[PDB]
Design a protein around this ligand. Structure first.
Ligand SMILES: CCCCCCCCCCC(CCCCCCCCCC)(CO[C@H]1O[C@@H](CO)[C@H](O[C@@H]2O[C@@H](CO)[C@H](O)[C@@H](O)[C@@H]2O)[C@@H](O)[C@@H]1O)CO[C@H]1O[C@@H](CO)[C@H](O[C@@H]2O[C@@H](CO)[C@H](O)[C@@H](O)[C@@H]2O)[C@@H](O)[C@H]1O
Ligand SMILES: CCCCCCCCCCCCCCCCCCCC(=O)O[C@H](COC(=O)CCCCCCCCCCCCCC)COP(=O)(O)OCCN
Lengths: 88, 75
């Protein structure tokens, strides 16, 4: 039992940049097609591929940190949908 | 009537928006290069007409020379 935490004095309580929509993980950069609509509230982390005509709506999280995530042609991921990938 | 300036401008705007469409971009992506394309198309059409007139004149001169050369065979 610890029941003891150490607050950090350099922790940011308000990021003026907001949340960054495209979050590259090392060499994995999410690829979004120019014809694809991704809402400004969406977070794309890791290796996530969004193809032509696809659309991702508000509040959706697509974390491709573990495995690959692919959204097909004219396929849509609607509001507040969490798409995640596992190792196996 | 249909002048070379207007057909050139329409062709330039059409080719700019065709290039934008071919790249999956909105038609009026960069508005300034649409104006640039209209101007270039107008210039190219006017130059094409001006070159066509001179080209026809030169062809007429060459054909006159050829006919004169052929006609001398009968002497
Ligand atoms: C693919 C599109 C299809 C569009 C074509 C169908 C629509 C019809 C419009 C076709 C169009 C533009 C060509 C567009 C080029 C395409 C764009 C290329 C890419 C651009 C991105 C040419 O059309 C005319 O051009 C004439 C050539 O002069 C030709 O007449 C023959 O010529 C004799 C040869 O010597 C033949 O012996 C004889 O049989 C015919 O008399 C014919 O071709 C036709 O009558 C319109 O005419 C335009 O050119 C001239 C008029 O002449 C006008 O200005 C002229 O400038 C001086 C001359 O330098 C003159 O001093 C001046 O007086 C005059 O004002 C322009 O204001 C405009 O009217
Ligand atoms: C003939 C029928 C009638 C057709 C209609 C004709 C109308 C007249 C022409 C209208 C043209 C309108 C174009 C709008 C102006 C846009 C030009 C911007 C190009 C530019 O900024 O330069 C960079 C690319 O250069 C370039 O893009 C230059 C490309 C040039 C390709 C051809 C070069 C000349 C070859 C000779 C002629 C072709 C063969 C003919 C036998 C852009 O850079 P970026 O930001 O996009 O990113 C990196 C991509 N590299």
């Amino acid at each position: 039992p610890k029941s003891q935490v150490t607050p950090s004095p350099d922790r940011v309580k308000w990021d003026y940049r907001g949340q960054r929509q495209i979050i590259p993980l090392g060499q994995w950069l999410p690829k979004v097609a120019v014809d694809a609509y991704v809402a400004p509230n969406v977070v794309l982390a890791g290796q996530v591929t969004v193809w032509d005509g696809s659309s991702v709506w508000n509040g959706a999280v697509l974390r491709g940190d573990l495995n690959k995530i692919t959204v097909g042609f004219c396929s849509n991921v609607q509001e507040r949908c969490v798409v995640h990938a596992a190792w196996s | 009537p249909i002048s070379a300036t207007m057909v050139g401008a329409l062709l330039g705007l059409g080719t700019q928006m065709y290039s934008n469409a071919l790249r999956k971009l909105p038609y009026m992506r960069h508005p300034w290069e649409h104006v640039v394309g209209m101007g270039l198309g107008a210039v190219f059409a006017n130059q094409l007409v001006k070159w066509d007139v001179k080209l026809k004149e030169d062809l007429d001169v060459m054909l006159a020379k050829a006919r004169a050369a052929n006609e001398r065979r009968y002497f």
